[PDB]
Amino acid sequence: QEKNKLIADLKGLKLHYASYEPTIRVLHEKHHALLKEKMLTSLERDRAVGKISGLQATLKNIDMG
Amino acid sequence: QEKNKLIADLKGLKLHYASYEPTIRVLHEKHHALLKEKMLTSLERDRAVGKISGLQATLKNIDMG
């Protein structure tokens, strides 16, 4: 009976980790969603900030005179 | 004999399982901090929008003369 329960637990751990690997895929699509909005949005943000500041300074000191 | 063979196979199985486990746990936590960085990024989007609102009202001010 001990070895019977041992084989039962063996299969249980097998299925437990074969169903764990789906959450590795789930985190895969999660960091994919990270890929959606992490870098191109940040790149466009920083370049927009730079150009906005530059043209702000230009127009402001143009009009101040 | 059967329990020894089962022991060997289960030990190998669980060795690679426990190789996978810390990787996915630290992946989860670093993913949480990545989402924190996402929140940071969205906040810089918001402050950039505030700066461009400043730009638009100041340009209306320079337009009126």
């Binding site: 637990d9 751990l13 437990h16 169903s19 764990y20 789906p22 959450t23 895929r25 789930v26 | 022991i7 669980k14």
Partner: peptide, 29 residues
């Protein structure tokens, strides 16, 4: 996110029982 995600959360929550059973089996061995 799907039933895979809820199952993963449940097994992560029950990982304490999972690790307890793992340690019990190792101690028996």
């Amino acid at each position: 996110q799907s039933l895979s995600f809820m199952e993963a959360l449940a097994k992560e929550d029950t990982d304490a029982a999972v690790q307890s059973i793992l340690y019990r089996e190792n101690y028996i061995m």
